[PDB]
């Protein structure tokens, strides 16, 4: 029997390369009346044209699998979706080549879609390994608010929760904004000096400019960016010493095409040695039924361990994403990028080059600055923490205990009355009690200073269900920690 596999490409030369690859492939393995040919088609601007053209291609012959590649252009995740939408109703597998977006990883949206390169939200393993290597324990996320960054943030959160060490803070800024300075001021000096950035190109440029205006790119900070914000116009403004990641062979599509041809050839040859098979339907106007060439083909395609080829070992996980990839940890020096290491998928082996950390110097900054200033929250109580309004000038009046000692006092900054609901004003009082002098002794022994302010809500804190949401958050004084 003769079975053919079609594809859509971006240039005529790629079509000739595909023809040569399939000609080389079919002249191997077995020849039990098996002959496969390649049918190609170029790209068109509008997506409905892609839909009609691809269903006409399906009409031409019973295509067992389709190869798709994103043309060289901006992200534009709308280019590959018409093929997946059209072929999904027939439930025929579709092979992707260069689309690295993480939206397609959802099983519900795309039931049949295979990827040959790891997605954008898949480099968090590299960051975790690098943190383990350089003994970094505190990080500050800066993920932008979009569907792309949610997967990365949740994967990193789960991976950190494996070790019972959560991220210090996660920030979110709206995409396509114009002034993000408030967030950077808020997160400039919390506890940590390791910034992990993942956003779009323009947002990355805005963040870079804002950070450069705040004098945060100086010595004592370590940047760890993804892949997108190292190429394009992101190099117009970028502090020296950023450590980005790059795919080893993300542009040489010929090797990917050859490996895909080989793996699907092996899969179809293995599948054809069975019983109870049918063919996908011919014509995008005649039949409206699910092709029986369905989940069995995908299941046998997933378990297709390949020994050694032009890119390395090929193994598919239960996510439709290629595993065991190679990453090139690289550093930027004096507006010129250079290689610093290699990620083989197990660990990272340093090369014979010394990194240049931001702000100059070569000392591997510890990335943790301790702040000897704590904000301490207390609540009103009868025998523990009294509250007495201060006198007119501002300083508290003196008091004497029966045995004759000057009871120590500190100045609180809590709201008055019962709640700041109607009046949104806070008047400085000063509080003394049984816990305050213990805190004084702790501060004296501990060699730090303090600053105490009351709690606005006034409750001790319990887990309360959010308003029509599936997330549980704390409240009151318990929620201010």
């Amino acid at each position: 029997k003769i079975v053919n596999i079609g594809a859509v490409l971006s240039t005529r030369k790629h079509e000739q390369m595909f023809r040569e690859a399939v000609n080389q492939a079919n002249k191997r393995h077995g020849s039990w009346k098996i002959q496969l040919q390649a049918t190609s088609v170029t790209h068109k601007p509008n997506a409905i044209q892609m839909a009609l053209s691809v269903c006409e291609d399906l009409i031409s012959s019973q295509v067992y699998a389709i190869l798709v590649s994103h043309p060289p252009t901006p992200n534009d995740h709308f280019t590959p979706t018409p093929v997946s939408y059209t072929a999904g109703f027939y439930r025929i597998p579709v092979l992707g080549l260069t689309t690295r977006m993480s939206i397609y990883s959802d099983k519900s949206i795309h039931l049949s879609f295979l990827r040959t390169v790891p997605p954008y939200s898949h480099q968090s393993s590299v960051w975790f390994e690098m943190m383990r290597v350089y003994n970094w324990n505190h990080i500050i996320l800066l993920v932008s608010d979009d569907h792309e960054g949610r997967a990365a943030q949740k994967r990193l959160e789960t991976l950190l929760e494996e070790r019972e060490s959560k991220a210090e803070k996660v920030l979110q800024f709206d995409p396509g904004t114009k002034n993000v300075t408030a967030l950077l001021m808020e997160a400039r000096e919390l506890e940590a000096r390791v910034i992990i950035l993942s956003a779009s190109e323009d947002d990355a440029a805005t963040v870079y400019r804002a950070a450069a205006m705040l004098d945060m790119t100086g010595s004592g900070y370590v940047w760890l960016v993804g892949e997108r914000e190292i190429s394009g116009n992101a190099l117009r403004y970028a502090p020296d010493g950023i450590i980005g990641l790059q795919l080893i062979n993300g542009k040489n599509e010929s090797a990917h095409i050859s490996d895909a041809v080989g793996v699907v050839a092996q899969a179809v040859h293995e599948l054809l040695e069975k019983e109870n098979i049918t063919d996908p339907p011919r014509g995008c106007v005649g039949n409206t039924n699910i092709w029986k060439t369905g989940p069995l083909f995908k299941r046998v395609l997933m378990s297709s361990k390949y020994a050694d080829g032009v890119t390395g070992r090929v193994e598919f996980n239960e996510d439709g994403d290629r595993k065991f990839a190679q990453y090139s940890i690289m550093n930027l020096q004096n507006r010129k990028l250079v290689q610093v290491g290699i990620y083989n998928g197990t660990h990272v082996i340093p090369n014979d080059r010394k990194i240049i950390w931001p702000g100059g110097e070569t000392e591997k900054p510890r990335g943790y600055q301790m702040s000897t200033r704590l904000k301490i929250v207390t609540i009103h109580q009868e025998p523990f923490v009294y509250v007495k309004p201060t006198m007119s000038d501002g300083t508290c009046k003196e008091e004497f205990t029966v045995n004759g000692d000057p009871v120590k006092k500190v100045i609180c900054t809590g709201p008055n009355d019962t709640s700041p609901g109607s009046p949104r004003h806070t008047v400085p009082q000063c509080c003394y009690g049984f816990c305050i002098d213990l805190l004084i002794k702790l501060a004296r022994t501990m060699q730090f200073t303090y600053e105490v302010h009351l709690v606005a809500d006034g409750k001790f804190g319990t887990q309360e269900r959010v308003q029509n949401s599936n997330k549980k958050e704390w409240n009151g004084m318990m929620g201010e920690l």
Partner: antibody
Amino acid sequence: LQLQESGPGLVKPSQTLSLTCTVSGGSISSSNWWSWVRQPPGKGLEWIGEIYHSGNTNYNPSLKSRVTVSVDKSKNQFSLKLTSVTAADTAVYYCARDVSGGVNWFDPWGQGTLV
Amino acid sequence: NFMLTQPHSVSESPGKTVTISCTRSSGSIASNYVQWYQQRPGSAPTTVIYEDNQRPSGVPDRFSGSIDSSSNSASLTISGLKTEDEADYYCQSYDSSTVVFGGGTKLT
């Protein structure tokens, strides 16, 4: 700050050149890179290499395995040891230092050699 | 890498405004920018403008520069021609792997 061009100077072919540049008014233990721009007579400019005081180097892909530039921390001087010099690459060699900043801003330029 | 071309055969009358252009052969000159170096005959080249907008600390304000982002060429404008104008002017850009120097230009 001032960069003073120096070096022995040779015109013989099929040898290895060795020129060293001294700096006055500044210290090489800084954050500024050091350039070695070469000037062919009657022509424009072409970049050669940069050296950081830490020790790492940055060369040109064309002449990758033919030019080596190193520095001497104790003597406060760097040098160029271009090897396998032919008779068709004679030129005048310039010593220049740029500012780190976020740009490449090679200035001020040195006196320049005449090899 | 790429190449740069400049009109090295431009020389107008004294007391006039002239514009010099450095063109980028390959790529789009919109992320990495260019600075101009002036070389007097018998000395070392000196910078006259960097960042394409701000002149160095101490220089006449007659010289100016701008870009079009359409023809992939950067234009440097000099006004009020005088005796202090006969010099070799060069443009230098850079991709993110090497450094690229222009052909150069001079006026009489």
